[PDB]
Design a protein. Structure first.
Lengths: 12, 339, 336, 339, 338, 12
């Protein structure tokens, strides 16, 4: 198992 | 230039300077940021922040079910809130800017890295599919779980990709060259003295690929061509080290060699990243989620350790491929490094 | 397995392989079959075969009773008898089975489909509207009339219904308000795949991404079927095939995440109004309509029902406002 | 990976291998292309081909109505159709792949670049008004006007931008380490001996800048700081060679040195581009119209020509800045090269 | 330069700065001015001031059976007299100029405008249709009714019409065209440009790069600027009409890559006395200009009720049978700001 | 003054 993400942040 | 991930949560809002931290030789580049926190929901809720040195080799829930997960090569764990009686003793002057601009509740954090961790490096995916990834990465999470730092969850986490790098030393090895003989069944004379002399040992991105190939000839068996080919070796030690041959670039001219003399041509090549884009199996330096990278730097395996280094071990070797009538493709390899 | 259709006058008898024709899009599934005709009734009588790509939006006699009739997108015609030059260069292996099986009076036939043809899709009838219908369809008639191939009449014409069914998008958007200035709803309805078919359900990994005030009530995800109809007015008919949900609430100043698992079933929306279905083979059980698409836009507009699907991810926030967001994704069949 | 420009009007379709051509040392990377032309509207219409190496430093129609235009650094012209007596003698094997891949009408072309040409380098615009556009480029065009090769227009021309990127030589220079001793009016001693010793001489876009800085000290004005700052010389030559200073990147911790000893630290930086994106006047290596580029490599001037090289002459240097009480910003510069 | 309006009872006068107000974007242009009333008719009667933003789509004593009237998207009210423990905390520099020049009587007034509101823009009527109209306007009223704050009429109401007019990449469309009686790409057509926001005074070159219009002769290439006259009362409604278009016979060849810049100037006095082309808001007889493009702000709650003008250079080619194929883009005409 | 552009082809 042990977790995942959100998926995107390209700057500030 | 500074950038933040403001968690939608407006509990943990993390301000950082650079996504790529320069992993030097004698030291590393430490992480140097702050975490703006808000007080009205964080009532006896406690701020922490961590650095995950993560290694990836597959699908995020298929490789989950089974008996294994990612071997996280390192995890650093910091407690921002509640603060000690002034925790931050060597305050960064980036986090002078991040405290004077921000509020009294803005919370420092720094993250030192040890001397056993590799870069952020991935392969290149194929243009065709069955669902695969791989690569090392460095990331930073700031979060707040009710239980102690030894437990955590969703619902507070602020994640940002950072990057770490190998950077080869001051000194090149010997100036690597090449001159072999070749013996056959049908033509007796030494037939291929082939001096692939070179200039340097550790190139980077933005230099030429010249190879001074000196044929010394006295023979029959008309030679046709000398192709020159930049082999990438995609070493991958997961359940076993494997190399996956694929030429990042290849050039050749029609320079033909007469019997009985010494002729020599420099064969001169560019491997560009833009030429091998939308192509399979050519390790690229691990990129920051969408950003353009370079072709993967050579990785080196330290002289001797108790544990064998698991994962992708990039090597690069310039093969000098030949064509001799009626077309036999004879060649050789050397060691050379792109770090 | 093979299937035939014999007219009640035993004159034109069609044998065919598949009712479902696999609409690839570089090519399309061509028709393969034969027509067994009898020649002593057909003494100087001329057999044909055709394929009608047709569009329906109502009653036979009544929209027959119109200023227009069916605007057929397509009709293919070919000469079965007399064989004008027995002209099939490639005989098909299905014809290789049928010509050996039947009496050689079996006339082969083959239908090429062009690239501008939309798929088989019918709007779902109401429960209360009895005589209301609308649907695209593909059929095949092998037929004869004394007149040269230009005309016909209903007799000697042998129907049959077939189908031309068409065989990592993240969303993240912010929501700013009047009385709560915070970003207040970032939300990522992430997924894994885009084009599913019948058999593999809909997980939607919705990552709650929300700040502080305005207590969120709930999240609920509704597979919503779009039915775009272009006859004289383009028209889109919104109706929820399936919607699933729980009560997993989120807190002020947190980043929650739920995978919501929905599965539109044909069996559940049986006996209902407003849900485009794939065309049936006249009585047989079908599926929920496959998403059609206009390839890149032909010079002539596609006149038909244009099915798309989506996951509409909806939320309620105090005291129950129905915030939401939508995306693109497509449902089409798997090929053999 | 071969690519084409099918000329807008389906007459002169140009097929080529690579858009980045290598600037070698011994040679250049010559062009090896063909042009598929159709024989129906090209009846006694004579096809040619060119390479228009050109400087750009402004607006099109505005700098048109002045006195000058651009100073096209170079232009090669060669006669594809009709072939003066069929002049492909040493065909490329890409010219051997295309001629048999395409129709019989395919007409080759081949350009060898001279030794007096600078590379494809473009000034960086800024966030604001960022189009007094500058930059060299290499471009290659097919055409056919009625009048002979010394006259042309636009209604046939096929334009395909390529590049020529400089590449570093085979030997780097001796280990550079050189700077100031700094005597004063009120504190007496040798007072900041400093050594920014280095390791190499020519870097690329793969490796960082370690600077081994050696303080030697017996203090009577307290030191408090050493920042190290890589500085670009965006040395433009239109009327004049033009030094435009700005730092691509710089780093520092807050290591303090005490009176009467010798201190030493390896400070270290990486100049990135994604950090220097959305910034003004930072010479970048040439771009392929929207494709990602990188920081400009060091340009260098040949060992004695007759005419001053006109263009942007990019240099680089680690300026070792120090901050001393009560705030004097002391520093010095050296040579080093990123070619 | 200053201007006022006085009532036939010379009771309320209004002194202002400029009838053209700059619809800025981070902000807007707030209204500033003073109201000048008299003493002794206005004993114990209470003067107020308002900003009426309106949507107009027809006739005055006719279109009031619309279930409604001009659906005033927004109306602002502030308490002029008796000043009410007055918050002109910032008094204006021009109100400073008006208070000492005129009597120290001058009642200042000031109007914030919200963000969900449109500019002042109207549909140009036909040359033959007389009793019709449409458009937005921003007007101001200064009045006093023997009432509560709610009741309101004329003859003390003084009304001034003012305005709230709004003061990319090099945008290029290169499209192919596939036919039923041709195979080739047959037309790529690249309308390359250099500006996306123009004003009154800078012309319209369209660099049209033709890419093989052959196997079907081309007559030639028209280029025609179309205003989009969007109107949202009950339904959004574009009304297509070309303001201007120009035209030379340059004749692209089979197997030859043509490119021509076509130079357009949309002028008003050429489109004066026409039908169906929005003009900018105007003041009662004086000269105006061709309407500015309005924009739709990113993410309002409620859709903007107004006329929503845009423009676009349509490049309509004409190919041998005289079949006129075309393509459009986005292209937006805002004002230049002082 | 010499000449001008079309302005874009990015790959094959």
């Amino acid at each position: 198992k042990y977790s995942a993400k959100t998926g995107l942040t390209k700057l500030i | 230039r500074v950038f933040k991930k403001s968690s939608p949560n407006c509990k943990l809002t993390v301000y950082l300077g650079k996504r790529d931290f320069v992993d030097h030789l004698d030291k590393v580049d430490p992480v140097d940021g702050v975490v703006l926190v808000d007080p009205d929901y964080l009532k006896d809720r406690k701020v922490f922040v961590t650095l995950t040195c993560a290694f990836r080799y597959g699908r995020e829930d298929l490789d989950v079910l089974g008996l294994s997960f990612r071997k996280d090569l390192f995890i650093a764990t910091y407690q921002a809130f509640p603060p000690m009686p002034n925790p931050p003793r060597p305050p960064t002057r980036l986090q002078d800017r991040l405290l004077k601009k921000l509020g009294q509740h803005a919370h420092p954090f720094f993250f030192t890295i040890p001397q056993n961790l590799p870069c952020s490096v991935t392969l290149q995916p194929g243009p065709e599919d069955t669902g695969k990834a791989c690569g090392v990465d460095f990331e930073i999470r700031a979060f707040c779980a009710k239980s102690i730092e030894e437990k955590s969850h969703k619902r507070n986490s602020v994640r940002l990709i950072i990057r770490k790098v190998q950077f080869a030393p001051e000194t090149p090895g010997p100036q690597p060259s090449a001159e072999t003989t070749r013996h056959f069944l049908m033509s007796d004379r030494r037939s291929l003295h082939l001096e692939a002399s070179l200039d340097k040992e550790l190139y980077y991105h933005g230099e030429p690929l010249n190879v001074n190939v000196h044929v010394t000839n006295n023979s029959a068996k008309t030679v046709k061509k000398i192709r020159v080919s930049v082999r990438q070796y995609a070493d991958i030690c997961l359940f076993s080290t494997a190399q996956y041959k694929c030429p990042v670039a290849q050039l050749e001219q029609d320079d033909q060699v007469s019997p009985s003399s010494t002729f020599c041509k420099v064969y001169t090549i560019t491997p560009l990243l833009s030429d091998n884009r939308e192509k399979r199996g050519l390790a690229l330096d691990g990129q920051l989620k969408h950003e353009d990278t370079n072709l993967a730097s050579s990785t080196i395996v330290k002289e001797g350790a108790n544990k064998e280094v698991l994962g992708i071990l990039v090597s690069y070797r310039v093969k000098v491929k030949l064509v001799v009538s009626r077309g036999g493709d004879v060649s050789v390899e050397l060691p050379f490094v792109l770090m």
